[PDB]
Point group: C3
Chain length 333, copies 3
Amino acid sequence: DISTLPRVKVDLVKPPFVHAHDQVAKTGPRVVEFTMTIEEKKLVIDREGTEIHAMTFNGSVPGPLMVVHENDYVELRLINPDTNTLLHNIDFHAATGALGGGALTQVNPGEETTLRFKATKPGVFVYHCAPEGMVPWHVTSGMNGAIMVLPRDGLKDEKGQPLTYDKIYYVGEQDFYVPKDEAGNYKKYETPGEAYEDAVKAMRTLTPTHIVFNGAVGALTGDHALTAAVGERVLVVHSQANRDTRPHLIGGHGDYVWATGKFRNPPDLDQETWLIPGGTAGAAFYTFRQPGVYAYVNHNLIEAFELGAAGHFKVTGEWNDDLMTSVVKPASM
Amino acid sequence: DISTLPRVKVDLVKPPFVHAHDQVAKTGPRVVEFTMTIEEKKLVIDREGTEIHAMTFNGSVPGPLMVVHENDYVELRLINPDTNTLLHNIDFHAATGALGGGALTQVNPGEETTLRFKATKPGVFVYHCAPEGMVPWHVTSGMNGAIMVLPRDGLKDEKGQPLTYDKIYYVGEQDFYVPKDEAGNYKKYETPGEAYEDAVKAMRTLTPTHIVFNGAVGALTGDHALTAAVGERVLVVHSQANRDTRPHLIGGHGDYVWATGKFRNPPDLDQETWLIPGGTAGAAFYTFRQPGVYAYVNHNLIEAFELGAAGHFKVTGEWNDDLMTSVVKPASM
Amino acid sequence: DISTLPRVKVDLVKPPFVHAHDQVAKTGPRVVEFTMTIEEKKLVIDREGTEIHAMTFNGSVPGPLMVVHENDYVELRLINPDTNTLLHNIDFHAATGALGGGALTQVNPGEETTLRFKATKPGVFVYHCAPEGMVPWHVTSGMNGAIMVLPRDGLKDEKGQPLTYDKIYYVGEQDFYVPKDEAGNYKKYETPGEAYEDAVKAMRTLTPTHIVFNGAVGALTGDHALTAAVGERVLVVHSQANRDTRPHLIGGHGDYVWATGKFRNPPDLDQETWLIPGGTAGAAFYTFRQPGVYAYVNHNLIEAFELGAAGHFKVTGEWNDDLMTSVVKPASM
Ligand SMILES: O=N[O-]
Ligand SMILES: O=N[O-]
Ligand SMILES: O=N[O-]
Ligand SMILES: [Cu+2]
Ligand SMILES: [Cu+2]
Ligand SMILES: [Cu+2]
Ligand SMILES: [Cu+2]
Ligand SMILES: [Cu+2]
Ligand SMILES: [Cu+2]
């Protein structure tokens, strides 16, 4: 009887950051309440000034990471303000029934709805907008995120022993298909409806123009680099709603990886690179052992370094010469 | 001594349906006999009327699913009637030797052959035509299917306990490369030989024009939707002979998934989406818990909803509000 | 104290062959010393005479396979002779820190460096050149290879029992993006710098022009076919530094496969085809049971048979009619 369970209201945070939560559940099952507001907005995605009409959950690409525990109830209030122009909804891959919620959450501008579902399966899952006849257009305009359903006793390794992360980050990888003129320049539009017909043609090539983390080329670099220290245990959650990716931490590894993201499965160990299929979220656990700059990339290196799928970690601490050292520095023969 | 084993003649059925068989073997090893007739035919693949010269096993794309048990002998009679125009053969990925049978099964129009092989490995496997110098052309004209080799004691879960399906369906996913004129319209040809030179150029782009289940856009929709009831255990076998796919059941999950399709391996649990590599068959097991319409898709959503890789399940039974419910229906703020 | 460990100098061999080594370690941890010389050179990659400016470790594409044991130290001397024109470095996916070594190994023409790192994780790993701002260009010009870190007690199966190979081969799969004129002919250049600007445009299409094993179309065919005998246990190591592949042995299987190549994980059994993600090395173990010619392919069959990703095995021994036999040879109906 859902009437009698405890409730908790959670306020979401902007990716790559994740809202506060407990790894090991301290309470019994709860109704966890979230609110998202849909926001259509112009977004600049590269250094040359390319602009698109992004379609967002809560103003970000990706939308925010939600965190609950197995057998919690997720109650989402979804608001589509009358400043928007399109119909939207939400499909949770974590949910059972009604196209993941999409059939029950159709809201025109000016409408809201509240959905509840039971988180019966632990893992990281994609959520995304999926309106009938316009699914890939909404998804590839940035209208996707992820939800994590932790086991009630937290993460465990391949031998059933506890794994505990010190930091968690969320990297949402987005494939964009920006329309082009005859010469190859990107087009601009005053409204999303205006872009629709060209967008469909651009999607059919199956060749993205940009592939980005956190909504833009270089978004997770410079001062927006991810941070950690030597000895810290980091969980990196990574989603791709539409297209396969192959993450890789340059200078590191995935010590424990759930590539398809479902925690009842034992993790893969010692991965250099792993495949996250389009429509899936994965998680990798790593303990940093060396300081410095790491790159975190889709290891199609054209996708990484030419089209934008590359971020950084800045890691502090002491260098360990036993793991690696320069015996003879670059010099003349 | 093969002379002394029992024999059984099996008559194949049209996909997505599967011929009758036992899950748990009731007899010892047998010689299981199948006959396939090759058929080159015009096929209409989309709603706009696009036409190709399909190359088929038994008149369908995909060719039919064969079902045997580990350590059975498969004896296939393969007939290439003189109404066809090309040389064909068959390569079973389930078989050991002679390029999977391809080197022993070359039949010109007007010829037949009979191959026997031992099913030494349990799993779902691709079979396809593979004539020397023309392999991708035959495969991508629809000349592929699958065979399932069940363990003698049936399917089992990750803990070694029996899994029993109530219904089984076969979804053969096909990538097509239809040649185009300068403006982008699809070309028509009077014969397959006539299409050959353009077909090779269209294949080299690596960009399909259509990706379909069961041979056509919308083939598994409307009245040809797959059916089940709440509480039924369904096995979905899925093959792709040429190209990676990532199936996903919208509103559901793969409770137990053998993504690369080999049953000596434990299944992956609770998958939202899984990768079936090109040249592979996979199987997913799901117990339906909610009624309604489900979509079954390749979760590259451009491939699904723009190029044709999308089917439906119509599921009957009672809605369960504990799993999902609309708390506040879409309405004005 | 590294001062006190034994050292051994290893001389590398040309792929697909692998330098001599022990499977089960006979000594304790050692410092294993390797030398590679960088070599920029013209390479002919197809039968039509297409030419590129390859960038190589030790004169081959791929660069040679290095073999060590878990907790050995790898000491690489890397030489960039003044006959070369570009800056190069090396990133080992096996290594921890400093972008896999890349930040410590930058050598201009005329320079050398020596790096040491500890092989803390068993598996097959990619290594590749990765100079800042030019990473995909170097990688897709052929500047990648692999290293194998064997467990100290060798390979084991899914039940922890020893697996021992009789032969090992290394297949390095390379995606090339050769620039084209308006009509589709491949361009030639006098120097690598000269090709740079066109190369970047050709890479951005994400569509390779050639995909090859061992540096050329048909390189592992004819007299350069891989060899084995019925009853021999073969380990095939396969790397792709940039792009997903799906190997398959036509007429065989992967009896034990580490698709993502990390040996602390149990292998997958009985694979027909398996996915090696771009940026990864994998290994497959197979015991040959039938003689004859086998093809070893990327099972995107367009990539295999049109773009070049296809090699052969020539296997000697006696045919086994129990596994496969032609009951009725192709003949007239
Ligand atoms: O080793 N990273 O490309
Ligand atoms: O959740 N299906 O796209
Ligand atoms: O069965 N090989 O394509
Ligand atoms: Cu939307
Ligand atoms: Cu989805
Ligand atoms: Cu054929
Ligand atoms: Cu095949
Ligand atoms: Cu280089
Ligand atoms: Cu790398």
